[PDB]
Amino acid sequence: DTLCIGYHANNSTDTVDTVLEKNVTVTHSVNLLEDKHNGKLCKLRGVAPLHLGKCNIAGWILGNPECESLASSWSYIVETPSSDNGTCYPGDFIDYEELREQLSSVSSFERFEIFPKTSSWPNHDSNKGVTAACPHAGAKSFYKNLIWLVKKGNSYPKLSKSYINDKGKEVLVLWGIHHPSTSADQQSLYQNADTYVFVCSSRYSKKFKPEIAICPKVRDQEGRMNYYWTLVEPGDKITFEATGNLVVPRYAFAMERNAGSGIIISDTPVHDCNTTCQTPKGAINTSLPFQNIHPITIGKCPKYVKSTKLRLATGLRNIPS
Amino acid sequence: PGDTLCIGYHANNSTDTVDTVLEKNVTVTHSVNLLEDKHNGKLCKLRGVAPLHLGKCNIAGWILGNPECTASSWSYIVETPSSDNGTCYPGDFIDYEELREQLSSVSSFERFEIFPKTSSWPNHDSNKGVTAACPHAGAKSFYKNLIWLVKKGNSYPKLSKSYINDKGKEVLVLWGIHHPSTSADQQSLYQNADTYVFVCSSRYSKKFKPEIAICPKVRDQEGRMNYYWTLVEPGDKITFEATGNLVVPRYAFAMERNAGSGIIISDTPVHDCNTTCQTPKGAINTSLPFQNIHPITIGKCPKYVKSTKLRLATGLRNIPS
Amino acid sequence: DTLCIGYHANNSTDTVDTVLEKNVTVTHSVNLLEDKHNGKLCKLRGVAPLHLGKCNIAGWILGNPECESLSTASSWSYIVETPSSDNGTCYPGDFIDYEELREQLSSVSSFERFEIFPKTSSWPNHDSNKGVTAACPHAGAKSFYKNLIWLVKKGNSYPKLSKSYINDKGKEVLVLWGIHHPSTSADQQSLYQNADTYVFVCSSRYSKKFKPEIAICPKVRDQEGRMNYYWTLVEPGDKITFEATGNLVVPRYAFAMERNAGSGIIISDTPVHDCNTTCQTPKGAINTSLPFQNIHPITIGKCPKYVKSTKLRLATGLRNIPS
Amino acid sequence: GLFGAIAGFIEGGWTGMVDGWYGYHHQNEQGSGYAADLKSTQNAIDEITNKVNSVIEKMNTQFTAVGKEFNHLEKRIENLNKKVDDGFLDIWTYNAELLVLLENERTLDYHDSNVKNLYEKVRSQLKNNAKEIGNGCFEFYHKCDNTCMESVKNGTYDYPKYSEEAKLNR
Amino acid sequence: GLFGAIAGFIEGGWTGMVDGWYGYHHQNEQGSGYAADLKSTQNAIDEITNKVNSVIEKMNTQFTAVGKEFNHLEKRIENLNKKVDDGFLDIWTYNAELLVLLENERTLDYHDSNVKNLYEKVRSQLKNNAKEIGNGCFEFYHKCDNTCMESVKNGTYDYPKYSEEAKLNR
Amino acid sequence: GLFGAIAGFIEGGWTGMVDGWYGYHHQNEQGSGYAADLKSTQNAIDEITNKVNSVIEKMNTQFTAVGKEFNHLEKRIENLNKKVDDGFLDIWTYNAELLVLLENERTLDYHDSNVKNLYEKVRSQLKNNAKEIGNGCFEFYHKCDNTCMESVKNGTYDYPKYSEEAKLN
Numbered sequence A: 001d002t003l004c005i006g007y008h009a010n011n012s013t014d015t016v017d018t019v020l021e022k023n024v025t026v027t028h029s030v031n032l033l034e035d036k037h038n039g040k041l042c043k044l045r046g047v048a049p050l051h052l053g054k055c056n057i058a059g060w061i062l063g064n065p066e067c068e069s070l071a072s073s074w075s076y077i078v079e080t081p082s083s084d085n086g087t088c089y090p091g092d093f094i095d096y097e098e099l100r101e102q103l104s105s106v107s108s109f110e111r112f113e114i115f116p117k118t119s120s121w122p123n124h125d126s127n128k129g130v131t132a133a134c135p136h137a138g139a140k141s142f143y144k145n146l147i148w149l150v151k152k153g154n155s156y157p158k159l160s161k162s163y164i165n166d167k168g169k170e171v172l173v174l175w176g177i178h179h180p181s182t183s184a185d186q187q188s189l190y191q192n193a194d195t196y197v198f199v200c201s202s203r204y205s206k207k208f209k210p211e212i213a214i215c216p217k218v219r220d221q222e223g224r225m226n227y228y229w230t231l232v233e234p235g236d237k238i239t240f241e242a243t244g245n246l247v248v249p250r251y252a253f254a255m256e257r258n259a260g261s262g263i264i265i266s267d268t269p270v271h272d273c274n275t276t277c278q279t280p281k282g283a284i285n286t287s288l289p290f291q292n293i294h295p296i297t298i299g300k301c302p303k304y305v306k307s308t309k310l311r312l313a314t315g316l317r318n319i320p321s
Numbered sequence B: 001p002g003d004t005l006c007i008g009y010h011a012n013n014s015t016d017t018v019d020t021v022l023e024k025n026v027t028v029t030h031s032v033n034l035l036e037d038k039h040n041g042k043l044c045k046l047r048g049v050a051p052l053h054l055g056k057c058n059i060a061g062w063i064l065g066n067p068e069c070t071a072s073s074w075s076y077i078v079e080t081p082s083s084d085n086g087t088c089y090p091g092d093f094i095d096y097e098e099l100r101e102q103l104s105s106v107s108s109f110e111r112f113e114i115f116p117k118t119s120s121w122p123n124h125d126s127n128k129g130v131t132a133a134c135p136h137a138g139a140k141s142f143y144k145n146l147i148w149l150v151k152k153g154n155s156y157p158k159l160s161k162s163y164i165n166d167k168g169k170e171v172l173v174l175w176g177i178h179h180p181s182t183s184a185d186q187q188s189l190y191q192n193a194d195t196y197v198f199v200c201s202s203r204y205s206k207k208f209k210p211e212i213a214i215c216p217k218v219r220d221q222e223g224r225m226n227y228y229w230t231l232v233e234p235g236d237k238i239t240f241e242a243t244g245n246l247v248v249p250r251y252a253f254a255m256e257r258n259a260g261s262g263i264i265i266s267d268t269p270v271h272d273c274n275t276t277c278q279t280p281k282g283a284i285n286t287s288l289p290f291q292n293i294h295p296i297t298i299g300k301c302p303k304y305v306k307s308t309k310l311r312l313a314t315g316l317r318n319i320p321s
Numbered sequence C: 001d002t003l004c005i006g007y008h009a010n011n012s013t014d015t016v017d018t019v020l021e022k023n024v025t026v027t028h029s030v031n032l033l034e035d036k037h038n039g040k041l042c043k044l045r046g047v048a049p050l051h052l053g054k055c056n057i058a059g060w061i062l063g064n065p066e067c068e069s070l071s072t073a074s075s076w077s078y079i080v081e082t083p084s085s086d087n088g089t090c091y092p093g094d095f096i097d098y099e100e101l102r103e104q105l106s107s108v109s110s111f112e113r114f115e116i117f118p119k120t121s122s123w124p125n126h127d128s129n130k131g132v133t134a135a136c137p138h139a140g141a142k143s144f145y146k147n148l149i150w151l152v153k154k155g156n157s158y159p160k161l162s163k164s165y166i167n168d169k170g171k172e173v174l175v176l177w178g179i180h181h182p183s184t185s186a187d188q189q190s191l192y193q194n195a196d197t198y199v200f201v202c203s204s205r206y207s208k209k210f211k212p213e214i215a216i217c218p219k220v221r222d223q224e225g226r227m228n229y230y231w232t233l234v235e236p237g238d239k240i241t242f243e244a245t246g247n248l249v250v251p252r253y254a255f256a257m258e259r260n261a262g263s264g265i266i267i268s269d270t271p272v273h274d275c276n277t278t279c280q281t282p283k284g285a286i287n288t289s290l291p292f293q294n295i296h297p298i299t300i301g302k303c304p305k306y307v308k309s310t311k312l313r314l315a316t317g318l319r320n321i322p323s
Numbered sequence D, E: 001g002l003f004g005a006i007a008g009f010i011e012g013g014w015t016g017m018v019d020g021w022y023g024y025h026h027q028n029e030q031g032s033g034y035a036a037d038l039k040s041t042q043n044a045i046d047e048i049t050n051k052v053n054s055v056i057e058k059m060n061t062q063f064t065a066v067g068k069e070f071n072h073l074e075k076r077i078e079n080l081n082k083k084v085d086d087g088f089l090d091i092w093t094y095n096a097e098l099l100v101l102l103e104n105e106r107t108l109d110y111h112d113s114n115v116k117n118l119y120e121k122v123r124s125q126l127k128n129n130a131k132e133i134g135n136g137c138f139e140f141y142h143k144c145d146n147t148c149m150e151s152v153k154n155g156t157y158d159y160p161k162y163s164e165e166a167k168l169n170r
Numbered sequence F: 001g002l003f004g005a006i007a008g009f010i011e012g013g014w015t016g017m018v019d020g021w022y023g024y025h026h027q028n029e030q031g032s033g034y035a036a037d038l039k040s041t042q043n044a045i046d047e048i049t050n051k052v053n054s055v056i057e058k059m060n061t062q063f064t065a066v067g068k069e070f071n072h073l074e075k076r077i078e079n080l081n082k083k084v085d086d087g088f089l090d091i092w093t094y095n096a097e098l099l100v101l102l103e104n105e106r107t108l109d110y111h112d113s114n115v116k117n118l119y120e121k122v123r124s125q126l127k128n129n130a131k132e133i134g135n136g137c138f139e140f141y142h143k144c145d146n147t148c149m150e151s152v153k154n155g156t157y158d159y160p161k162y163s164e165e166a167k168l169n
């Protein structure tokens, strides 16, 4: 008569490493490394992203004619790696990264006409401000959100327009400063020759002088146009004053910025799915603590590691014999 | 019938529990907490040196000597969350966050009259430079550390003024540039109309020109005043030149900067206590490795964690039965 | 007749700590802490550093007369300045985005100096042969940066200048120039004739207008005037254009380069050697499989992690009980 | 292993014992076969589940974007950001790898401990009345029917009951 | 659990033994009572104290002012800074939580080991001069007065002295 | 120690046994001497070196240039950079220190375990034909020569072949 003490063994081939010995076959185990994703760009916090298609943020916020995309809210922004469509008229976009970052997630967004075109500029020409650098259906055109003002009937009066923010939230205001290639063009566009532009709120204040020189052609333009922006706080006023060279605001955006999100640049399609962790390669749906999909993630994510295998033993050494 | 000797372990009335990797809520006979969760609700000396407390003012107001606002050294700076505006005359304080950072902790700090008011400006008026934007006791006034020089008897000669740093330590120098709202104001203050200011040390060099414009009224000013600063190395010289629009240094500050600390913005009261770790909510006596009081700390602190309890078992499982 | 089961002991006095007990003598142990370096600056990833001698990055790149101008390898894995490197911007002024440039030059896989604007043929209407100064002395004589030319008026006029460079080099070209700010109006006229001047520099991406700022500043290397230095990278196929009516210190030599990723700048007297390393320290290179090191926090390469530990004795044998 | 039993003096495992992790193999008149000790098994199952859940659930991470965009004149800060990302990567990689190595050894010790404990629980009960024939087995010096076995497993083996018979077969 | 003594074959602890972690209860002709073993208790106290001080004192903290101030055009670097604080937050939270869970399990095992060793050290002395009656108790086959008891507690037990009397009561 | 052998019931070690970590000392009519157990010594060496190699090879770091240069007006980011380096310093210094303290304990316990399992291995062989005389020693209730003495060291000892001789002693 015998009584024996013993332990289980099964048909398992799963292997784990221990500190003392590598490749121990065990009866049961679990994976701690999430290595799957869904190859989709999905919603975050239930909120879809802003997909800009073939356009970049600059082209979209300025109103590049090529950028008639479609929301009042977004969790993050998506640009495609092949998104050229932005500053069609060449020049410097000041603090562009900062703006991109600050627009990365908004809880409320509203485009309004801050300086109505039909009524704001009686002493200036607001119809001839177009260029082949910014075509619309092959035709000369310009940013939809700004107006390139030029002299009217051989005169460019000193303009002075102020706007008071009665929106009850931050208003994003963008404008341009045009620099002709020649004194000849300066006179043709603005008459005056030696001009200035002044923008100031209660916070913001900067003076601009045209910088006239022949620069290397870009999209066939030897001239330059620099783009500027600011956020006018509720109740604050912003004032524009110019004697030439000012590319006035037409549309501005009232908004409530949301904590801080990010910008994904990927060809990965968007779908009607939901996630808590987003990767440029697809969403991660895991309860696991570690992940080796992508280091650049947005949301509440597992930690990125360069592990290929993170397998925890649960059972014991498998020795069927 | 036998005599007996039994081997056993301690139990007691202890209700302390701990978690282990294998089982939750295990009652143990003895334990210690690894998590510090208590603070003294006071702002104390760090390294035995008191913080600088700015009362109702902010660094700008304090350092410029705003009329509304004796420590030769401090370990950090405290501002209350509802501190008054430092700059009374509206404008931009250039590299403001940097200056704050660089003043966060100093040893040796001495305000001295760099350009004595009595003898420095024989050809300009150093009395009439007061303003409704910086009121004091029902009277127009101005910063105590600067002088708003204006023309004397319809003339504003070129001014040229230099200081050599013989303090044996860094000298902080602050000045202002005034940008009137109109040409009339320009001439009324400085006579000259087209002016410049130049400030250069061996390391610093900048030229300023007034940018006349009507900006939104702030404390009744449509004009603006920008504030600048630089740190003059020992033995170096700083020069000021101007034909108008220069708000000149009156008092400067000799200081030795420490590696630096930070600025605590809080209504928590300062007290004559000692600590090695300061929090905006209060000080913590660092013995333990971890701390859940506040992620923003100054000093030699325990690491911040999101933990509610880190109970370390010292004794054994408590089984009184 | 007895048989005993037992364990090893020896003469060793190696000691280790455990969570439970301190100074436990053991039979065998190993250190997990790398505390040795070789006391040399080595080739990283097979490539020598660029050692700047008595010059800093500014003096070297501008061609301070004391620096050795290429020469300079066509590649390097990092840069070494000595703590005593004295020769930089000999004519006093601001070097714009200097730290950015230093970082961007720290590691290069290709680097070639070439005469972007030949001294003799480029400036028919201006004087390209007088731009020297006591601030930048050489073999006991006034001199200047080798890679720039201080253009001055010819005879008694300074015609409007206009000159471009189109990048045919097949890779990024680093172009540097200066803007001179005389101490007085007298000097402005003495040098440039024109009293009110401007400089303009633009490419497809860069654009900046410069305006001379005449003032008498504190004397540095005998100069009350100032000279500010600027730079930009001209991508392949693009053109950079210079326009001036005075005050422009024109490029003479520029640099065709292919930059790598990271790397950094070591400032040290530690001798450079023909040794190879994967981890470099300002005080010597690290050669170790160990995961931790206490040599230096500032390292370049694939390095062990820096810790403040003094020893990290790992037990391999058992408690040593010779009794 | 640390406790000597598994892959030790108990050299191999029982595929036959499909009902649990640890158990017994009994043999006598009436029959024989494998039977897992459901008490120690379930206990071990609960405890290991808690282990696995601790490693997972103690990871509660902040909401973070990670990605940053810097221009051509922000190389230094672009590389600072890269150092942060890479520092976090080296830390979490080393930590995840070692956690698994270390805790895998612990888990194997744990199973070994559970078995050893079963084995000694039987040993302290039987004493004389049985032969410790090694390899994890005990040979009884007395007849041990089903309810006798069950008793040994249940920890209520009546030593005196079989004392007499036991001595005699010795 | 790991060593089988605590909450194992010795089912419960003793509120009556209030001067140590591990000790004995004796019962003889002269009387009965509790007595902590001072050797094993102090050694444990020393070692558990060393454990706590190690987890504490190995935390060399740098002087750091965590806080930073950024203006409205510095959100990218403000967010990098946030990423840094949040990265250390998750790293320290997870490791501290696991350190505690893991060291706690080790601490209990340590005590369980200490008790197990104490029991088997007595058992090795007494040999067959007493019977293991379970629950951590030995019942002597011979008379064991105070001095006899105290000699078992402090290792200086004289087995051959009671050999004769022992063999009788079996 | 955890397993109560090393510095436990086997009070001390043997300087005389130089060819291994664990082993035997025999003493019969013929002679005496020390002899390491090769199979248990080699496994421990296989496992300990694997433990050393694991702690080392799991550290596979990124190519990094740690240093940064910031000017006199970039103090904030310079201190941010400083907070990053110091944060990694504290994380790695702590982890390294505790890794060592904890694994050193485990290693010493590991040896303790190996010795105990070897002792209980031979006690499992000599069953009734020997007496545990303490301090890790067995005294044969019979007479054991060199050939027999090697049977116990290899796990081939023959109990029933001595059972009768020992029953009388």
Ligand SMILES: CC(=O)N[C@@H]1[C@@H](O)[C@H](O[C@@H]2O[C@H](CO)[C@H](O)[C@H](O[C@]3(C(=O)O)C[C@H](O)[C@@H](NC(C)=O)[C@H]([C@H](O)[C@H](O)CO)O3)[C@H]2O)[C@@H](CO)O[C@H]1O
Binding pocket: A128, A129, A130, A131, A132, A133, A140, A148, A150, A179, A180, A181, A185, A189, A220, A221, A222, A223, A224
């Ligand atoms: C062989 C020859 O002489 N060909 C010219 C041909 O170059 C010229 O085209 C004009 O070239 C000028 C440069 O000198 C500009 O590039 C003009 O482009 C536009 C533009 O599309 O951007 C035309 C546009 O209508 C203008 N918009 C406004 C609001 O004025 C702008 C604008 O003036 C500039 O961008 C400001 O710098 O320029 C381009 O038409 C044609 C046209 O006259 O004549 C040929 O003889």
Ligand SMILES: *[C@@H]1O[C@H](CO)[C@@H](O[C@@H]2O[C@H](CO)[C@@H](O)[C@H](O)[C@H]2NC(C)=O)[C@H](O)[C@H]1NC(C)=O
Binding pocket: A233, B082, B083, B084, B085, B090, B218
């Ligand atoms: C001076 O201080 C006042 C507060 O005493 C500032 O008022 C705040 O303005 C900021 C935006 O600039 C808001 O974020 C706060 O909500 C305002 N406080 C409230 C509730 O009134 C004011 O901006 C400061 N003025 C100047 C000249 O800077």
Ligand SMILES: *[C@@H]1O[C@H](CO)[C@@H](O[C@@H]2O[C@H](CO)[C@@H](O)[C@H](O)[C@H]2NC(C)=O)[C@H](O)[C@H]1NC(C)=O
Binding pocket: C064, C065, C066, C086, C087, C088, C090, C135, C136, C137, C138
């Ligand atoms: C390079 O640095 C050296 C010093 O290391 C400079 O040499 C000095 O130059 C001044 C000015 O002419 C002389 O008065 C000194 O006698 C020199 N000192 C030495 C050590 O010789 C030199 O000027 C620098 N050259 C450049 C172009 O920067």
Ligand SMILES: *[C@@H]1O[C@H](CO)[C@@H](O)[C@H](O)[C@H]1NC(C)=O
Binding pocket: B045, B047, B048, B274, B275
């Ligand atoms: C404050 O504490 C520090 C040490 O922590 C000491 O140097 C200093 O003297 C103390 N001051 C007082 C008032 O105790």
Ligand SMILES: *[C@@H]1O[C@H](CO)[C@@H](O)[C@H](O)[C@H]1NC(C)=O
Binding pocket: C275, C276, C277, C287, C288
């Ligand atoms: C690293 O060390 C090995 C010996 O451990 C030596 O042979 C080799 O040359 C060293 N490598 C370098 C490049 O320092």
Ligand SMILES: *[C@@H]1O[C@H](CO)[C@@H](O)[C@H](O)[C@H]1NC(C)=O
Binding pocket: D150, D151, D154, D155, D156
């Ligand atoms: C198991 O033990 C319990 C007491 O713990 C007892 O009541 C029960 O009858 C036992 N079962 C068997 C089969 O002996």
